[PDB]
Amino acid sequence: YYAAVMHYAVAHNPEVVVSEHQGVAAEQGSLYLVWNVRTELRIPVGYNAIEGGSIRTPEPLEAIAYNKP
Amino acid sequence: GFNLKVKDLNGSARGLTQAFAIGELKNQLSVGALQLPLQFTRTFSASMTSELLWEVGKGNIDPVMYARLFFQYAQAGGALSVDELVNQFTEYHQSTACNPEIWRKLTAYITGSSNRAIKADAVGKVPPTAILEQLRTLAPSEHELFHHITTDFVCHVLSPLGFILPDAAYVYRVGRTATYPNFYALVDCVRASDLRRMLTALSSVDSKMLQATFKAKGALAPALISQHLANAATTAFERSRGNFDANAVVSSVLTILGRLWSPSTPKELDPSARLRNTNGIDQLRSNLALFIAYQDMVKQRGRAEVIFSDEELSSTIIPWFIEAMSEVSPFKLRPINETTSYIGQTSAIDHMGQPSHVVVYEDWQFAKEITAFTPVKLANNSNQRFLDVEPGISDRMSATLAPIGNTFAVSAFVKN
Amino acid sequence: PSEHELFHHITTDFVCHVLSPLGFILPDAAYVYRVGRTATYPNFYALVDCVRASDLRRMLTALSSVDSK
Amino acid sequence: RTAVYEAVSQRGTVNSNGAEMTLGFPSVVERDYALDRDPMVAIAALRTGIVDESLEARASNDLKRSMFN
Amino acid sequence: IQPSEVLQAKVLDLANHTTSIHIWPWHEASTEFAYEDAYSVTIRNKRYTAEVKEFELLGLGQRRERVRILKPTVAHAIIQMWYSWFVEDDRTLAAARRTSRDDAEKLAIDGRRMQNAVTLLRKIEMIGTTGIGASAVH
Amino acid sequence: PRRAPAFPLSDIKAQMLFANNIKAQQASKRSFKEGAIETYEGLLSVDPRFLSFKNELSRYLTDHFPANVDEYGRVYGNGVRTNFFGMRHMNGFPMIPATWPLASNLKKRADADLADGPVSERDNLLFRAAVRLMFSDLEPVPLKIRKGSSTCIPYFSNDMGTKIEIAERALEKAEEAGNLMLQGKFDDAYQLHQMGGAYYVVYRAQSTDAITLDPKTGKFVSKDRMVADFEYAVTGGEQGSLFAASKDASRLKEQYGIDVPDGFFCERRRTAMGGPFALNAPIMAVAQPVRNKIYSKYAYTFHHTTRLNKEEKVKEWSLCVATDVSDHDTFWPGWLRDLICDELLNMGYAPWWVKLFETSLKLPVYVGAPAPEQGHTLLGDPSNPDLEVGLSSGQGATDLMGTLLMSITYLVMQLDHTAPHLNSRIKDMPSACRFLDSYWQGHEEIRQISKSDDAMLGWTKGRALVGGHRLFEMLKEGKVNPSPYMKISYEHGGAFLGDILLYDSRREPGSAIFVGNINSMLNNQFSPEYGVQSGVRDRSKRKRPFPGLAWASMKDTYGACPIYSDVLEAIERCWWNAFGESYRAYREDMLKRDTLELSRYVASMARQAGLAELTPIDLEVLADPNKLQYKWTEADVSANIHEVLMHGVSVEKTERFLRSVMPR
Ligand SMILES: [Mn+2]
């Protein structure tokens, strides 16, 4: 199910990285992926307001959320 | 299908938020900012559809296909995973190939009577099959499969000698596999990768030698057929092992990959000389599609110590010995978007313009034809049931489905 | 005379090539010439030169070859 | 010359560009200087753009022979 | 961006082959041996100009008639660019002191000016008195 | 020390071998052979204009074509690994004086510290296993023998029928005679069956030498050839000395007065030895079938034909390791003989025959005239022989020995330093059985190709390879050799039978590939060894039949070398620079004359039908029959000239004979 979105989160966009996100516990490694894509200048969508040019972005679905049909 | 809020998806489909793929919850929704970029490219291909029959058939035995079958049934079967199944197979292989007294009895069921192998004369009174029943009398498998394959082995070495007489055929269906997922499945794939050579060494080498010892024309052979067969078969079992641990080898190569992926410090783990780009692992640098394996790797487990690390190794051999290159499985392999090339997409929506309705989906089948059958069985044993379609209904019911494909044009249906 | 002998050598080379099977390989010496740097390289007229020369590849070789064993 | 840049303060900037800054090509000089044509005359010929019609088959066009590159 | 850029040519071996066989860009490569660079030294109210006949700078004797240097390229473009760019330099700086404007800058540039020349000064000795122009001063 | 007894040449034993005839007594009395080979008929080795042809050849070309083997000794680039200057010798005149072969390198084996037996007793078992299998299943087939092959020691008869009587009587009472030797009646069988006897020193001649140009002054230094004297010999490496023979040609500008062009020393005088056949009959009669065996039961490490034959096996490999072997013959252990005879008997092999081996395997020798005013020294005492002279050439099964211990120490070392944990599947002698079978079946990660000393190695995905890299590294350093039986280095500039494996930038077994050496071709042209003795009606006696063949076969041959045609350029060019003519048409006509000469020699290839019957390999065997005596195995030849070269021997006599020799 997770394997789903990521793949077509590849196309749109090859934007990547992200960091290991150790938080406070615990650094055994923890690094997913990020997607800057490119956007329209309005964001009533996504808690990550980061409209600036484009969302960066923490989660794959938002790319699609900002994606064209 | 279901629905969820976008801003609140972590409060909604919280597991689905990928941050969940990591143990992250926190005050914080993962993320932040950092470093090293490379689109992770070239994903393993499309195992969906492509259903078809395959033939076990000949005793000439292709380990490769059989492996594919093992993963196949394994996911499809009554016993996960492939791993334990391979263990059980090795057990059976001991109980059979490494258990010589059986073979005496087998030759006994073949030409066996007295003063074997009844000099130079032929006489191969056997269906392949009858052997199979005799072995069925022996140790049962929950999952015979290989129980056929062992017979196939009996054929392969008895093929040079006049016992090609039985030759019938054996058939089995596929089974659809997903995206495809979990690294444990990869573990299955790597132990199966061993099976490729855990098995073939007995599937091969074998003997062209002895016809049947020749000794013109060849040959007398008491237990000597069973002798030469099994003792070599056991010997073949010895060279087989695969040595290298299943979960370990993937754990390590995944370790080197993920820490290669690391923007935060690689530290002692690092890109290096022959530590990396060994004319293949760099191709994995290009195969970074198997990302997520690192994700659950820390999640399913935790620290990914390379433990059999070494530094020459590996490098050296182990990444070389990675599964996809040994190509079992619906492990599949491909460039980028073709796996995505079955993704629907409809922004729909308006004025805002972005949000209230943006759907996705997939294009799909309706080859209407569907079939049914009697389960004829020439002899009781398991489920080797012959079946013939029942066209008289089978066609018309399919015909009944014919408009229905024009109905529910799912793409058009999305428009709804 | 040629203003630009060059081929004037080459015609001799042709004399050699067919006289090579016969006992007149005796003269065999050697001939040498430098390059010359060329630019980006430019104008389509130069390409015109290149295509007529492209003909020369076969304008010439047919006499440079076939020949006689 | 890069070092010259800080000379001279202070910031303009709209009133007068901008500057060429950029070209100083070794290549364009050598291409013409190889024939000892002296490229430097060709330079101004690209300043005004138009060729000054020094009508000679090894004069005028050779200038243009450079301009293309 | 700052160039990657590595290209740099090389003279052809020539002699190793023309020890056997003729080349034909010749003529082109020319004659070719300048120069009589006389120079004066105006020690107080007197001239004392001196000059020298190229070949013995090399210490060879005597005059050679028919030695044939090529006409090496590349470098011409560099040194020319160097020359002309100095022209851009001193023109700009001199104009700057002519008005800009505002003292803090003028000394800067006129200060700047100095070491620019000073810089060239230094490198010019490397051009000469270190092989083989020491023969020239000699 | 203990001198191997230095009986005078004159001795009745010296007589009993020889037919006491022309060649017999002459060979007893033989002077030092010397003489420019007619390097081409109508063309000795000595022609000065051709010498200048060498001059231009090696100089101008090595100039143009420096070697391309990398640090690892693995190869790239042009693929050259060799000075072309190895041409530059008196290739018709040997570099003189000569070595005196020992009687025991056992201390020399204790200097290289080569082991007196097993490392691990496990290793012992391994030895016992290779022995177990080399002494295993057998499918006897008729023996065969070279036509025109002199009986050498003993009689030196050229007649085949002599060899017939000898071998057949041997078939009749090898039991009785090997018993006599067990009974110690050496000379009785030696003078009735005339079995066994002695070796006679002869020469291999290294056509080349490691001539090295000096950038600072042009010196051309061939590798020095350190050699034993008679005392270093009899005192098994104890007394005596190790020393270069004179390389000089001015000593013939001296003696012969012959002019001495630069860099042209004299070919190395390697020394083979001939010996009695009656025991070599059982040797071929089994081993040749054993040859067929491993080539059938295994091949793999063993089959030897096309570079393709090998390469296909190779590019497979993730890792590959060409081998490099120290003095291949002398080093063979006698305790190895001990285990041999051991398990021979253990597995029912005939004790008299076993005695026959040990007789030959320590058989007394003889030195002719190693220098003028040298030799004619009978050696050993065919009454109590005890020689540990190493692998004498008279045996043809020596190759089995080389391939043996080499493969041993190889695989073993692979255990030692790459797969020790894997030795766990080597639980015992039977485990060694399934295994060794499988390894020569190749179903293993650690791997090899093998042929006597020459060999290579292979590796893959699977839990063993990184240690292969390690052992690789150590051996590449060569700083210390783990092998206690051999000084096995890597060969920088490694190759297998002239199959120079090439590597690309990736430097992989799957990278670049074997090539037939072209410099080796040059050798074939110009730096081989023998003359023909044209003064005989039949070329069957002649050392070197039809060189023109190789000419035509060249692309088909060493055109495997990529740069091939350029070599053609160079050769034809330099010849026009030499005799100023067409070495092309020259050699073509030589080929034509080869066809002419062979034409009457051949029947079924009706008249001058053309050469279509002969394989390009067999073509290589027809320009070069000679290596068939130390490269090609007999079966390789197409049956036509095979029989022109060889003659059959009865399957039956040999059959029952083996039935005796074999544990049944
Ligand atoms: Mn080789």
Residue numbers in the entry:
A (entry chain B): 486 to 554
B (entry chain B): 1 to 416
C (entry chain A): 140 to 208
D (entry chain A): 417 to 485
E (entry chain A): 555 to 692
F (entry chain C): 1 to 664
Article, verbatim:
Finally, we present the structure of the φ6 RNA-dependent RNA polymerase at 7.9-Å resolution, demonstrating that the structure can be determined for a symmetry-mismatched, globular 75-kDa enzyme inside a 15-MDa icosahedral viral particle. Localized reconstruction provided the in situ structure of the P2 polymerase to sub-nanometer resolution. The reconstruction was of sufficient quality to allow unambiguous fitting of the known atomic structure of P2 and to reveal possible P1–P2 interactions. Others have previously located the RNA-dependent RNA polymerase under the fivefold symmetry positions in the rotavirus and under the threefold symmetry positions in bacteriophage φ6 polymerase complex using conventional icosahedral reconstruction. Such an approach applies incorrect symmetry to the symmetry-mismatched structures, such as the polymerase in these studies. The application of the localized reconstruction method to the polymerase complexes of φ6 exemplifies how this limitation can be circumvented, allowing the structure of a viral polymerase to be determined in situ. This opens up new possibilities for studying RNA replication and transcription in the context of the assembled double-stranded RNA virus capsids.
